[PDB]
Amino acid sequence: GRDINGVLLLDKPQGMSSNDALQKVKRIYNANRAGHTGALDPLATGMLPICLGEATKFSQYLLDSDKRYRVIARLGQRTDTSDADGQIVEERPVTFSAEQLAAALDTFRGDIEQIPITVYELLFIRHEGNELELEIHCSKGTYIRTIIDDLGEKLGCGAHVIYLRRLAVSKYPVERMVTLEHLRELVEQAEQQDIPAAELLDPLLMPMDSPASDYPVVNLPLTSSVYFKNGNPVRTSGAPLEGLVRVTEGENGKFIGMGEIDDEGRVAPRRLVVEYPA
């Protein structure tokens, strides 16, 4: 067991539970501390950020972050789960027009309400026969299967999800995702070269502060960071005029914790990497 800090952006295998994925990654990295930031539907594939070490302290900031999905729906069939695995409960002919489709899709854009929320972008990829493919960038708490089911009813033919992939969480680069196979291949490569697995695995991690990517970064000179790390507010130009911020110190931008602009406009410590002394 070793103390390793960072975030592994795993491309979760179809069918695997987030917990099983977490355990496998934790073991591969031999991390003493690991957790995820919200279970991804077992039937979905895609980005599952796994926080290691200190990164776990800032998991909450990813839980309430935005997400982007690619979804393929089967039109004409409503199922008893709103998805592929299961038998049909209601089948109807697909007769809606292209203009009706565009109109129905527009009702799912922007601030909307659900009862099985904000859809920043609903990208129409294609509609061919009984298949509808879309990309949805939404706020936390959004129910994708409910959007598809409701859309299916609005179109008058019904629909259910046959493909679901989370392309990204927050601003994490989709290209930085890695598969379990790739992780295993690196472990073998390391064993083969007689070098620690960590040497090839660690470069794949995103920074320990990345779970808080939705918040701006404020760098403090070491003369000011000492006060902040001791639990005291500090003034800094650049700092936003409101909200949470990721705080770093020195020339190398070492992350020291979350801060929040207080009433006076100073950067007050909210969740530090280090503990307060007695």
Curated annotation (Swiss-Prot):
Catalytic activity: uridine(55) in tRNA = pseudouridine(55) in tRNA
Inducers of expression: Weakly expressed in maxicells, part of the metY operon that extends to pnp.
One example of a Gene Ontology biological process annotation: tRNA modification
Record note on what altering residue 12 to M/R does: Reduced structural stability and decrease in activity
Recorded consequence of changing residue 36 to F: 2-fold decrease in catalytic efficiency
MF terms (GO), sorted A to Z: pseudouridine synthase activity; tRNA binding; tRNA pseudouridine synthase activity; tRNA pseudouridine(55) synthase activity
Residues reported in the UniProt entry to bind substrate: 36, 69, 143, 166
Key words, A-Z: Isomerase, tRNA processing
Keyword field contains Cell inner membrane: no
InterPro entries the UniProt entry points to: PsdUridine_synth_cat_dom_sf, PsdUridine_synth_N, PUA-like_sf, PUA_sf, tRNA_psdUridine_synth_TruB, tRNA_sdUridine_synth_fam1_C, TruB_C
Enzyme Commission number, as recorded: 5.4.99.25
Reported effect, residue 13 to G/L: Reduced structural stability and no change in activity
Superkingdom in the source lineage: Bacteria
Gene Ontology cellular component annotations, sorted alphabetically: cytosol
Active-site annotation: 41
Residues of the signal peptide: none
Protein's job: Responsible for synthesis of pseudouridine from uracil-55 in the psi GC loop of transfer RNAs.
PANTHER family according to UniProt: PSEUDOURIDYLATE SYNTHASE TRUB1 (PTHR13767:SF2), TRNA-PSEUDOURIDINE SYNTHASE (PTHR13767)
Homology family: Belongs to the pseudouridine synthase TruB family. Type 1 subfamily.
Stated name of the protein: tRNA pseudouridine synthase B
Species: Escherichia coli (strain K12)
Name of the gene encoding the protein in the UniProt record: truB
